[PDB]
Amino acid sequence: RQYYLSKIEELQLIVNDKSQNLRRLQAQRNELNAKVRL
Amino acid sequence: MITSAAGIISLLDEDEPQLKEFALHKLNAVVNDFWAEISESVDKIEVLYEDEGFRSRQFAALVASKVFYHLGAFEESLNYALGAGDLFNVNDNSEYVETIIAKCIDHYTKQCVENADLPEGEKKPIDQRLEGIVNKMFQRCLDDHKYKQAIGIALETRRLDVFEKTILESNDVPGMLAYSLKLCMSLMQNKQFRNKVLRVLVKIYMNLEKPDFINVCQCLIFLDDPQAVSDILEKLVKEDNLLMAYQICFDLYESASQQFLSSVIQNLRT
Amino acid sequence: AAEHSQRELDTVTLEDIKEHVKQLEKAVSGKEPRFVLRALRMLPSTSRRLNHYVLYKAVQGFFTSNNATRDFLLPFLEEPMDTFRPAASTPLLPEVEAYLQLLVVIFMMNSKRYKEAQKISDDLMQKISTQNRRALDLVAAKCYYYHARVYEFLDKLDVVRSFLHARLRTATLRHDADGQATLLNLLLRNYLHYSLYDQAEKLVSKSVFPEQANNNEWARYLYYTGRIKAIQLEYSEARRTMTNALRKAPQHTAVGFKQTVHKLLIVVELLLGEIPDRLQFRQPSLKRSLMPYFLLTQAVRTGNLAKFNQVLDQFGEKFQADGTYTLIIRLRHNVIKTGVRMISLSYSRISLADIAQKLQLDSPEDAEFIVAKAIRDGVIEASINHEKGYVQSKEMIDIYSTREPQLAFHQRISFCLDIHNMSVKAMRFPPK
Amino acid sequence: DLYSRYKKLQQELEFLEVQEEYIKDEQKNLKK
Amino acid sequence: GAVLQAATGMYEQLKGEWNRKSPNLSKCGEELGRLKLVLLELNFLPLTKQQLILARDILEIGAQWSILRKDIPSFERYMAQLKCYYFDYKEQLPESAYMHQLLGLNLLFLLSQNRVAEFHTELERLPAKDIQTNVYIKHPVSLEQYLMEGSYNKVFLAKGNIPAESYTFFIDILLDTIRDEIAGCIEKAYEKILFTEATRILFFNTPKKMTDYAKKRGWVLGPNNYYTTIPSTELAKQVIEYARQLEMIV
Amino acid sequence: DDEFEEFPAEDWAGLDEDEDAHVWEDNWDDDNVEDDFSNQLRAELEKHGY
């Protein structure tokens, strides 16, 4: 029961962290792609 | 009142087993207060547990499991919690028992999937104590009436027997069946295990008092079993429920592939 | 006049409380951590005012769903006679209620009211032990910190050892960072307050301090482990850790913390044979406090035993008040080692009789034993020649062309590349 | 409920890993 | 219940034999063994005040027997349990007459086997007022300080200034410890020390004893009685690591 | 910012008068004792002829 909740919250924090990381990577790639396109 | 730990660890070095047993009881009394002094003296607990002549070797295993749970040695803490025997009271709501339960479940799931993908002859023997504590957790989940959680753990552990038990013993058989069907179709990537789950679902559906023949046919299409669908249609014809037959055939055409329909129409003719 | 200004101050403090509550609510929005430390950062500023009127207004303002958890603070809460929900009956977020209870805790802490303070802190941390949300982990750190602080002036710091141990573990499994560091520091302070240095050392060796910890918490941990290793004869690493602590301490505030760390650093450096720089003995905020340690240091530089004894006799109360008496005694017997370090720093080759004459050692063999003992440690790099009487020092090879600069500059790479990597990782672009 | 949320979290995490690896590869190629 | 009275009678007999000039070693040892056995049922550690007092007396007699037996490992465990019974959270036991005697006993023991860190921690445990006042702990602290300076001859002089006869046991082993530490510091200090000077200042009065101790260590006599490359591998790895941290994106 | 109240903020008594309150950053060597110069010189060479 509560083991489900512990796993869920751990995955939730991991997913939040990796989502911020992915957003940052997307911004970097977007700026580089904009430079290339220009 | 006590001042430090050195007294009890010093008692660990005595020769009389009863002194060691009393010291182990004292250690299990206060291990959440101060574990560090026992961490370096763990070897004493190890040799005490490894002595087959110790009547309370299970208490030594429990103490070492607690200490390693402090240390984070969760593999070794799991090993010595399994070695703790029945003294590991699952029903207790302590933090230690709870996190060791979580580690037990994770280890069981890992070993279970590793055995499942492997063929029959290469299955590494799962520890009986780990399987037993997992079964105890399954029973506790069943008693607490949280049937969905037990279903999910059973799916994780590839244990179709517990999955069937949870589905049948649940108060709402059709609702749990629908929930399991949605889960299996939308979440499971293991094709062979999804097929096993679908076969279990089909068997439960047929053994239901009023079979959900529509869902049976859907699951059979997913399993690619035109023979079973043809036999179901023949039985429906014999049993006069023609509206089931017609709706089933229409769903079959709307969903099943051309080869599936050809096989069904062939078995229907013969 | 005074009433008007008091009312305006109370209103603006209430507005800051509203803003902090809104920030805590926003922190859960987006399902991300942080944005709570923004409210918790101005915690000393809000704590400074904490009038009864503003506390009562906040209690009545954010608790439209009346429960018993507030009905305990109300008996101690005093409302204005002649003298606002910011607004439906939406249930309170756990972080918000924990926050308001924490400011209640701080107010009751400030007014010397301790027993009911113990009660309210107990009811505060009883609930948070049930939650499993990371948003309530940052607040839990301050909750534990002021809980221990409340038990401190209540002179019951020994009682809470079990509770802090349990919460420290709980944080360890949940991979908490701020709560873990705060709990570890509180545990170290608890161990030190009863001189359980061995227990603290054992705890330190088995517990890893989180790297992402706050600056203040890192400084506190460094000071505590430095005191450990200093009273545990590991003088060199203790001094290194104490200096590192002074680097990370706040610059403007933390006068008492810096005073204590400077006192211990002085004693440790003197024990190591080095001489603390006179600059620290000159800052105003540090001068008078270090004045007893100043008269001491001079004696160590001179080796004047009578001056050392007089300083001890006239300042033992102050030395014990900060728990440096024992280390000062060890220094009283390491003054000779300090003198030998100076002698070997100045001279290259020197006869042992000269050592004895300069250090007032009254024996050449005694000087030989003392210099041999000192050179056994890393105190002095030399090579005694008993056949003649030399204390010949080691030849100073060119540090360049010796792979030593390569090692140091490699460490500095590792650091700078690491800094660049964390900087580029923490950019955190927003969604909109 | 709980298991469904947990499985959704795992699937989302795996997809995030896929996107991260994709973006790193594309970053290398875009630098070229 | 009556078990504590039975233990009281038996350890009264034990101490009656103990105060005799030469108590029977095996008899008192077995008496203490079964005594702590019944002490276990008598709530060994966590309470009746007399209960704690009698347990403290049992452990004190046990430690003093342990030193009297002339055995080290048991002594550690007896004083460890006694520390568990000594001075923290107790606040109810009357100030024992043997408090400081065994406190200094433990301190000198810690000095004996090169446990200076533990020695100073236990110094921190006990109150500061007795450190320079009580002779029983003034002594071991004094030898520790003399060892810290390096005034070994002072330690040899003060070896006869023990505050009680129940100190010589590891006074001897500490006299050996200071000599072996002297030898270690000598080998890490000098370049090539002559045999006769070592014999003089190692306090090995018998030259044969000094030679035997020389054979005891890898530090050997010698003939006349007178006792780089560019690695390019790991630092190449370091440079490649820098190259990695430049590349491979964030 | 933490004020570190756990460590008592050691009050500088009553901000009593200091030594100099000067602006005079000094070193460790300014506190010793000395006896002029010429005295030394004559006192150490008249033994050899001054």
The answer to whether the beta carbons of residues F1 and C253 sit under 8 Å apart is yes
Both tokens of C57, joined, read 């207004």
CB B93: neighbour CB atoms within 10 A?
Answer: 8
Chain E residues bordering chain D (beta-carbon distance below 8 Å): 248-249
Could you give the 3-state DSSP secondary structure of residue E22?
A: coil
Q: Residue E150, Cα to own-chain centre: how many angstroms?
A: 19
Q: How far apart are CA F48 and CA B191, in angstroms?
A: 108
The answer to whether the beta carbons of residues E175 and E156 sit under 8 Å apart is yes
Minimal Cα–Cα distance from D24 to chain E, Å?
7
For residue F24, give the chain C residue with the closest CA: C282
Chains that touch F (3 or more CB pairs under 8 A): C
Q: Is B183 on the interface with D (CB under 8 A)?
A: yes
The answer to whether the beta carbons of residues E108 and E170 sit under 8 Å apart is yes
Both tokens of B49, joined, read 């547990």
Q: How far apart are CA B141 and CA B74, in angstroms?
A: 23
Picking from C190, C191, C170, C193, the residue whose alpha carbon sits closest to that of residue C180 is C170
CA E175 vs CA C131, E156, E172: distances in Å? 60, 7, 5
CA angle C411, C417, C422 (to 5 degrees): 125
Q: How far apart are CA C224 and CA C216, in angstroms?
A: 12
Q: How far apart are CA C148 and CA E181, in angstroms?
A: 45
The answer to whether the beta carbons of residues C98 and C136 sit under 8 Å apart is yes
For chain F, which residues make up each domain, given as ranges?
Answer: 1-48
Q: Which of D5, D9, D23 sits opposite A22 (nearest CB)?
A: D23
Q: Where are the alpha helices (DSSP H) in chain F?
A: 38-45
Q: Is B154 on the interface with A (CB under 8 A)?
A: no
Instruction: Report the amino acid identity of residue C161.
Output: R
Chains that touch A (3 or more CB pairs under 8 A): B, C, D, E
Contact F27 C278 (CB under 8 A): yes
Q: How far apart are CA C293 and CA C327, in angstroms?
A: 12
Backbone angles phi, psi at A32, to 5 degrees: -65, -40
Instruction: Report the amino acid identity of residue E41.
Output: E
Chain B 43-72, CB below 8 Å of chain A: which residues? Answer: none
CB B76: neighbour CB atoms within 10 A?
Answer: 17
CA C387 vs CA B258, C352, C390, E211: distances in Å? 106, 11, 8, 20
Both tokens of B225, joined, read 């079993």
CB B131: neighbour CB atoms within 10 A?
Answer: 16
Helical pair C215-231 and C325-346, crossing angle rounded to 10 deg: 80
The answer to whether the beta carbons of residues C56 and C77 sit under 8 Å apart is yes
Specify burial of residue B187 (Cβ count, 10 A radius: 0-12, 13-18, 19+). middle
Q: How far apart are CA C374 and CA C386, in angstroms?
A: 16
Could you give the 3-state DSSP secondary structure of residue E190?
A: strand
CB B70: neighbour CB atoms within 10 A?
Answer: 21
Both tokens of C398, joined, read 């060119």
Both tokens of C158, joined, read 């020994």
Picking from E52, E64, E56, E50, the residue whose alpha carbon sits closest to that of residue E17 is E64
Q: Any residues with CB less than 8 A from the CB of B42 and at least 6 apart, and which? A: B64, B67, B68
Instruction: Report the amino acid identity of residue E10.
Output: M
Q: How far apart are CA C396 and CA C344, in angstroms?
A: 13
Same domain, C318 and C408: no
Backbone angles phi, psi at B120, to 5 degrees: -65, -40
Residue that is written with structure tokens 């690591």 in the block: E241
Q: Residue C316, Cα to own-chain centre: how many angstroms?
A: 24
Q: How far apart are CA B177 and CA B194, in angstroms?
A: 14
- Which residues in chain A have Cβ-Cβ distances shorter than 8 Å to B152? 4
**Could you report how far apart the first and last alpha carbons of chain A are, in Å?**
55
Q: How far apart are CA B159 and CA B154, in angstroms?
A: 5
CA D24 vs CA C311, C415, D21: distances in Å? 66, 24, 5
3-state secondary structure chain C: CHHHHHHHHHHHHHHHHHHHHHHHHHHHHHHCCCCCHHHHHCHHHHHHHCCHHHHHHHHHHCCCCCCCCCCCHHHHCCCCCCCCCCCCCCCCCHHHHHHHHHHHHHHHHHCCCCHHHHHHHHHHHHHHCCCCCCHHHHHHHHHHHHHHHHHHHCCCCCCCHHHHHHHHHHHHHCCCCHHHHHHHHHHHHHHHHCCCHHHHHHHHHHCCCCCCCCHHHHHHHHHHHHHHHHHCCCHHHHHHHHHHHHHHCCCCCCHHHHHHHHHHHHHHHHHCCCCCCCCHHHCHHHHHHHHHHHHHHHHHHHCCHHHHHHHHHHHHHHHHHCCCHHHHHHHHHHHHHHHHHHHHHHCCCCCHHHHHHHHCCCCHHHHHHHHHHHHHCCCCCECEECCCCECCECCCCCCCCCCHHHHHHHHHHHHHHHHHHHHHHCCCCCCC
The answer to whether the beta carbons of residues B33 and B67 sit under 8 Å apart is no
What is the dihedral sign for C-alpha B206, B211, B212, B213? positive
H-helix or E-strand spanning residue A3:
helix A2-37
Q: How far apart are CA C122 and CA A20, in angstroms?
A: 37
Q: Any residues with CB less than 8 A from the CB of B151 and at least 6 apart, and which? A: B163, B166, B167, B176, B179, B180, B183, D3
Q: Which of E125, E190, E238 sits opposite C410 (nearest CB)?
A: E238
Would you put residue C49 in left (φ > 0), alpha (ψ -120 to 50) or beta? alpha
Q: How far apart are CA B148 and CA B171, in angstroms?
A: 11
Minimal Cα–Cα distance from B95 to chain C, Å?
8
Cross-strand pairs, E194: E226
CA angle C407, C409, C410 (to 5 degrees): 60
Minimal Cα–Cα distance from A27 to chain B, Å?
31
Q: How far apart are CA D1 and CA E67, in angstroms?
A: 67
The answer to whether the beta carbons of residues C186 and C145 sit under 8 Å apart is yes
Could you give the 3-state DSSP secondary structure of residue F38?
A: helix
Could you give the 3-state DSSP secondary structure of residue E194?
A: strand
Backbone angles phi, psi at B14, to 5 degrees: -65, 175
Q: How far apart are CA C67 and CA B27, in angstroms?
A: 41
Q: Where are the alpha helices (DSSP H) in B41-127?
A: 42-50, 57-71, 74-82, 95-117
Cross-strand pairs, C167: none
Picking from C99, C22, C103, C4, the residue whose alpha carbon sits closest to that of residue C56 is C103
Picking from B92, B55, B62, B91, the residue whose alpha carbon sits closest to that of residue B78 is B62
The answer to whether the beta carbons of residues C96 and C21 sit under 8 Å apart is yes
The answer to whether the beta carbons of residues C352 and C368 sit under 8 Å apart is yes
Both tokens of E140, joined, read 């071991």
Contact B102 A6 (CB under 8 A): yes
Q: How far apart are CA C189 and CA C195, in angstroms?
A: 10
Q: How far apart are CA E119 and CA E108, in angstroms?
A: 8
The answer to whether the beta carbons of residues C217 and C188 sit under 8 Å apart is no
User: What dihedral angle (degrees, nearest 10) is formed by the CA atoms of B6, B65, C185, A5?
Assistant: -160
Q: Which of C375, C387, C424 sits opposite E189 (nearest CB)?
A: C375
The answer to whether the beta carbons of residues A15 and D14 sit under 8 Å apart is no
- Which residues in chain B have Cβ-Cβ distances shorter than 8 Å to A10? none
H-helix or E-strand spanning residue B141:
helix B128-143
Q: Residue E121, Cα to own-chain centre: how many angstroms?
A: 13
Q: How far apart are CA C141 and CA F2, in angstroms?
A: 13
- Chains F and C touch, contact meaning at least 3 pairs of CB atoms under 8 angstroms apart: yes
Longest dimension (CA), chain C: 95
User: What dihedral angle (degrees, nearest 10) is formed by the CA atoms of C213, C178, C268, C294?
Assistant: 100
Annotated resolution, angstroms: 3.1
Contact B183 D4 (CB under 8 A): yes
- Which residues in chain B have Cβ-Cβ distances shorter than 8 Å to C206? 35-36, 39, 70-71
The answer to whether the beta carbons of residues C200 and C178 sit under 8 Å apart is no
Helical pair B242-255 and B258-269, crossing angle rounded to 10 deg: 150
The answer to whether the beta carbons of residues E132 and E138 sit under 8 Å apart is yes
CB E158: neighbour CB atoms within 10 A?
Answer: 15
Backbone angles phi, psi at B189, to 5 degrees: -100, -25
Minimal Cα–Cα distance from D3 to chain E, Å?
34
C-beta pairs of E63-66 under 8 Å, 24+ apart in sequence: E63/E102, E63/E105, E64/E18, E64/E98, E64/E102, E64/E166, E65/E18, E65/E23, E65/E28, E65/E29, E65/E32
Both tokens of E143, joined, read 């030898």
Residue that is written with structure tokens 């008693």 in the block: B143
Q: How far apart are CA E232 and CA E235, in angstroms?
A: 6
Q: How far apart are CA E34 and CA E13, in angstroms?
A: 13
Both tokens of C124, joined, read 């505060």
CB E126: neighbour CB atoms within 10 A?
Answer: 20
H-helix or E-strand spanning residue B182:
helix B173-187
Cross-strand pairs, E190: C384
Q: How far apart are CA B1 and CA E88, in angstroms?
A: 7
Picking from C422, A27, D31, D18, the residue whose alpha carbon sits closest to that of residue E247 is D31
Residue that is written with structure tokens 């299970």 in the block: B58
Residue that is written with structure tokens 């710091």 in the block: C157
Q: How far apart are CA E46 and CA B26, in angstroms?
A: 8
What is the extent of the structural domain holding C402?
393-427
The answer to whether the beta carbons of residues E118 and E110 sit under 8 Å apart is yes
Q: How far apart are CA F17 and CA F21, in angstroms?
A: 8
The answer to whether the beta carbons of residues E103 and E136 sit under 8 Å apart is yes
- Which residues in chain F have Cβ-Cβ distances shorter than 8 Å to C298? 31
Minimal Cα–Cα distance from E33 to chain C, Å?
29
Minimal Cα–Cα distance from E241 to chain D, Å?
18
Picking from E120, E31, E84, the residue whose alpha carbon sits closest to that of residue B10 is E84
Probe site for chain A from B98, B139, B142 (most A CB atoms < 10 A): B98
Kindly provide the b/e burial profile for residues B136-171, where b requires at least 16 CB atoms within 10 angstroms of the residue's own CB: ebbeebbeeebbbbbbbbbbbbbbeebbbbbbeebe
Probe site for chain F from C106, C187, C223, C259 (most F CB atoms < 10 A): C259
Number of H helices, E strands in chain D: 1, 0
Q: Which of F3, F26, F27 sits opposite C254 (nearest CB)?
A: F3
Q: How far apart are CA B87 and CA C101, in angstroms?
A: 41
Both tokens of E137, joined, read 């702990």
Q: Which of C278, C284, C285 sits opposite F26 (nearest CB)?
A: C278
Backbone angles phi, psi at E194, to 5 degrees: -75, 155
H-helix or E-strand spanning residue A23:
helix A2-37
Minimal Cα–Cα distance from E245 to chain A, Å?
17
CA C359 vs CA C137, C305, C307, C336, C337: distances in Å? 58, 12, 16, 7, 10
Could you give the 3-state DSSP secondary structure of residue E226?
A: strand
